[PDB]
Symmetry: D2
Subunit: 282 residues, 4 copies
Amino acid sequence: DIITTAFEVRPLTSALGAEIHGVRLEDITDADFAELRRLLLKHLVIFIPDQEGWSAESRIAFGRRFGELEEHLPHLDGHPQIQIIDSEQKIPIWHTDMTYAPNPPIGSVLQIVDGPAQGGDTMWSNQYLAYEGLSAPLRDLLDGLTAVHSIHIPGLDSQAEHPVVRVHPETGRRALFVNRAHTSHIAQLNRNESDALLQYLYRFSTSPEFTCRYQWRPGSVAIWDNRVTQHYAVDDYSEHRRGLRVVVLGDTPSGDKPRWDHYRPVPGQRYVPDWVNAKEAY
Amino acid sequence: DIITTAFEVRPLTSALGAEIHGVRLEDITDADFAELRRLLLKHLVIFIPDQEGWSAESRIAFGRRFGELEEHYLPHLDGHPQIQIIDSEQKIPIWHTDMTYAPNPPIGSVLQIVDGPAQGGDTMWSNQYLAYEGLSAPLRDLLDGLTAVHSIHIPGLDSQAEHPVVRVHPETGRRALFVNRAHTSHIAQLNRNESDALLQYLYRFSTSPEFTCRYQWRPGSVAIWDNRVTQHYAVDDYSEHRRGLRVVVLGDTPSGDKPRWDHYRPVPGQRYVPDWVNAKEAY
Amino acid sequence: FEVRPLTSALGAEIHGVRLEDITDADFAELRRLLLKHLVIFIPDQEGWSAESRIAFGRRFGELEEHAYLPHLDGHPQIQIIDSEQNKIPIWHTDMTYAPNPPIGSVLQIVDGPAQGGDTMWSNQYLAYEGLSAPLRDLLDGLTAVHSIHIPGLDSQAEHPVVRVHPETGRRALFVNRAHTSHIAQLNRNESDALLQYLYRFSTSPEFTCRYQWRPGSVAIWDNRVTQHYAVDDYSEHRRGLRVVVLGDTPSGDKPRWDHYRPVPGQRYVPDWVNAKEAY
Amino acid sequence: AFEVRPLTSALGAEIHGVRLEDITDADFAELRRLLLKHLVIFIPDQEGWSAESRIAFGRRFGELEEHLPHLDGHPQIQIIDSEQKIPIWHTDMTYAPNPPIGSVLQIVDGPAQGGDTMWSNQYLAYEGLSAPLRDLLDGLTAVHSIHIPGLDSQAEHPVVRVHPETGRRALFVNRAHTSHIAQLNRNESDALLQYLYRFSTSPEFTCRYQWRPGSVAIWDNRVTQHYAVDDYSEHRRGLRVVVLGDTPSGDKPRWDHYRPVPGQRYVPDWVNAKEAY
Ligand SMILES: O=C(O)CCC(=O)C(=O)O
Ligand SMILES: O=C(O)CCC(=O)C(=O)O
Ligand SMILES: O=C(O)CCC(=O)C(=O)O
Ligand SMILES: O=C(O)CCC(=O)C(=O)O
Ligand SMILES: [Fe+2]
Ligand SMILES: [Fe+2]
Ligand SMILES: [Fe+2]
Ligand SMILES: [Fe+2]
Ligand code: NA
Ligand code: NA
């Protein structure tokens, strides 16, 4: 339904992703930006090649066309809004950014400025298709559920409850809103039922039929909508890999009112996972 | 190869467990004790009914025939730090071998349920000899060369220990699996993802019903089990008050083959991403 | 009668019964106990006559005349369960691949070892009730296909995932590992994941009992709301006599969704490995 | 000689500056070298490649399969048509005693996006296992089988095979066609194969190729798996030549086959439906 005829557009896969040719971000016009925004709502992640030398001031202004920018992670000297993604300073797990926060980012703009000629691909997945591919009884179940997303590390403790199925505010289409990295458990199920259901959803939602895989070339820029995607940074390289990122704040994942109360354990109830995880990491 | 003809013995299952009749623990003789010890090495867990009123001094002396007794943070009978009080009001249904997160787990325990319902609260035991012997030869060969880290991290108790995956029983010379769901963390020579897959298989296989027994407690019943070669599981199907008296015999050193490989070495920054979901937050 | 429950979940041993000439009023008490305890055990019934065994089964309904299993000579209704002549170490509910599974059975182990060969049963009411409310609500609206495909026997049937016991009105899970194939309104991969969870949860030790057979003991169980499992831990000869009561018609809610419809050429690729060849 | 653009660290490379139609013996040697290095290579812009040249090219690698519809007068050139697919990781025909050593595939009709093919590096799948597990697998074999109307075949192959040219060891099991490991019981086999299948197709071991008109893919079936993504509805047609003659070879097994007892039954620990679609 969204018309996007200005630039030359090369889709990556049927599910999502498109490379946009004929764009120069440095001095982009308002009209050209509006077209990129429509392409982002259509393709969920878009790639802008050959943008070497993009000035810091233009990079920040571009991000601010989408919303307020986050101030984190190292940042570019003189620009707290430009975050540094440096392999010498890696994320090979499917995730949606910062969903342990009540208001995750709406999206990001990432440019790999130094990297290997091969290795270090990034994958994205289409959470609309992950929801739409579930059968009707399961979609109906998930519409009424919420999940807790959490992180507990030194210096960062956060948790948030979000609908399992969210509407995109600017398309009105429903998308799965759970991810392996940050989702803990479904709130209305007991933990063992939650484990079983999330295990299925994590695998199904990152099926190759729902993903794209991008090979970075120096100067390439990726822009993605964090509301309706997951992504994964492939850890297949030893070379130095360095990226500049701006992160657009302000999502509020919203869906149906939950149709059941939170699961209430009895006093002293213990969670015994059905599947083994080690007690100690590396 | 162990002869045990003195008492009336009623085995529970083919795998393990036997109820011993005609026994009075209160003033047991040395000869009768030697027979009970043989029955324990043969049957792994034995049950002695009708022992209501067993005196504290006699219970302690009985335990001490097996080894040194644990004394400790846990309520105990007045004047007897060795006799622990177990109380449902002060419980987790999970297969475990006692305290394998310690370098020296207990040899075994003697437990008598003194208050409880007529049904509910059964305890199951499993035979870790059969769990190992039931694995095919390539897998037994693999496990013989592996060790595993066992650990616990709770308020006031932090402990870990590395044990052979396959231990020999020092007094029978027979080999037994030595991992359990509750306390084993990971196999040391595998990466964590491989470890998870193998332990998941082993935990399920080792508690197959063909390797277990299930005991219904009656007032006065005493259970004595060998912690070197069993797991056990407390069924959580009751709400009534449940109270027991327990003595714990210290002094195991799980021993097996020298490991055939070095510990797995992760690279700097390497991250463990489990293949199977566990929740981040419990109850 | 003196009634001794086995576990909180189900099962009770009944002393003081003589099945051979049981009165109509004593039978009514056994029936009440069966609805309360789901499986009941009657010890000390050695020598129970064939005619009395058949009359007892017929108090519950029509008895099955099996085609494959041997039967006691002269009595097509008394089936033989013999370890030499054939064991079933898999959780199952009897014949759920049929549109009308049995409503229960009466089994007596007449010869067996002093240990080994226990049978376990599970309580499918508690299996359903132990699910959280969103999942109970989901299952209430689903059905499942149960099937068997062997030489000489080919049968499938569609049953509610949650059935209402006709006498008690209480809801019970009605899927089992051995004979359930898939949930009809989900795709096969979703079905696999949900059934895998249900199978393991439904046979949790908190929902089961385990019975050690003594020669002469009789078990009577309600096949509408139980599963059972025959432990395969013995090599000695084990022989039982069984009568099977026909006539279940599992009933539950109208499904809330249509069957899942694959597209032409769609392929089922299971998420979990099974071997392509058995033994 | 050529301009070589690798797809991922693990495997795959696109080769520019090639013309297959009249390729010289020396340029073919370079393609062969690149195939041993990159496991699957992609040759764009080969529209119009003649049937006689396509057959001669395949015959440089070995004998060609002559069994599917095919081009008029050329039973070696198989026609693959979506309208006449299953998304599953597989190595071709491993249910046969001598699976193909590789294939040459050109998509001639297809959509601009959709229908990618992924390949995985079975050397890295093996090498990424820890030493105790590599040691175990070295001594095992597996049965591969297929049972469909008109085709029943099974074969036993080493779980770890030595590539005859490179001498490097590669995993040799795949989800589609491997049944079970022969020296384990079936439940142990399921658990180990489940782990191996998922590990071996990790994204760090794979590449994903987007087909363009005229593109030719050449892959070594001895040390790869591949997967056809099922994300399209448009018509998709390819021309394929299959090179026969693998004999997967590895270590003598260190244990005998597992022997069940009479009457023993296999009860899988994980649910599969009894009926497909
Ligand atoms: O390094 C990458 O490709 C992506 C990193 C990432 O997860 C992010 O920028 O949010
Ligand atoms: O309470 C029981 O039945 C067993 C408790 C237990 O795990 C123990 O005493 O070590
Ligand atoms: O042999 C047993 O204990 C039970 C066998 C069985 O499944 C039956 O009788 O339906
Ligand atoms: O169509 C494809 O991309 C792959 C088909 C395939 O599996 C083969 O040609 O062997
Ligand atoms: Fe990210
Ligand atoms: Fe314990
Ligand atoms: Fe049965
Ligand atoms: Fe193929
Ligand atoms: Na469970
Ligand atoms: Na893995």
